[PDB]
Ligand SMILES: OC[C@H]1O[C@@H](O[C@H]2[C@H](O)[C@@H](O)[C@H](O)O[C@@H]2CO)[C@H](O)[C@@H](O)[C@H]1O
């Protein structure tokens with residue numbers, strides 16, 4: 001339920017998130033955007049469905065749902081995701097090395113809100129230039 | 130206006146902040162507390178007065194002000210602060226190992242709100258128990 005607010009994530013920067021995935025959890029959520037009603041990227045690993053459902057949020061309506069069946073990490077372990085923001089798109093680097101890519105459909109050249117929902121408890125985040 | 134809402138900082142754990150002091154600023158603030166109304170530790174380095182002002186704020190009530198002139202850093206530099214929360218006091222470890230201490234006046238055994246004002250651009254946040 002943690003929520004970082006008013007950060008300055010410009011294009012080219014890299015956000016490094018390390019946290020722990022609660023035992024026996026269905027999944028979790030990492031939201032990046034301008035605010036709660038505007039999520040440029042909604043990274044959501046569903047252990048239940050065995051997928052990483054990524055999607056965007058523009059107020060009330062979600063965008064087309066994209067899915068990646070490359071859930072190669074487990075609960076009980078503390079892992080790290082490295083998502084690098086780029087005007088054109090985001091590249092999330094999964095803990096097992098596999099890079100993902102989600103489009104910046106909302107045209108936002110600046111992120112400022114992050115929120116950790118679900119069974120993930122992040123111990124630290126690092127914003128690189 | 131940067132604010133980390135919803136953290137789970139209990140006594141014993143340690144927050145480890147890192148950032149850049151904006152060139153030309155007169156100071157910056159790091160608030161640790163229950164919210165905007167309740168601040169258990171208001172950490173404020175004044176380059177304009179060359180001290181570090183520490184105080185507590187119970188909604189409207191600002192406690193007795195503490196001033197520590199061990200302000201051995203300047204703007205344009207990257208500093209590191211380590212805040213250990215003992216339920217009885219806050220111990221702030223300055224960039225140069227010098228340790229400060231501020232009594233937990235509001236008697237809380239949990240901190241869930243961080244906020245940064247002033248000319249400090251935060252790059253790291255690590256919280257571990
Ligand atoms: O799209 C991300 C969004 O999905 C919601 O659930 C979807 C579900 O993934 C989809 O298969 C179904 O058709 O619609 C549901 C929404 O009504 C989640 O509830 C939400 O948290 C996001 O993860």
Ligand SMILES: OC[C@H]1O[C@@H](O[C@H]2[C@H](O)[C@@H](O)[C@H](O)O[C@@H]2CO)[C@H](O)[C@@H](O)[C@H]1O
Pocket residue numbers: 171173182183184191194
């Ligand atoms: O106690 C922290 C608190 O300080 C206020 O500033 C004081 C200042 O310390 C004092 O020298 C001056 O005489 O009065 C000011 C206002 O009462 C800040 O206004 C407040 O934001 C905190 O930083």
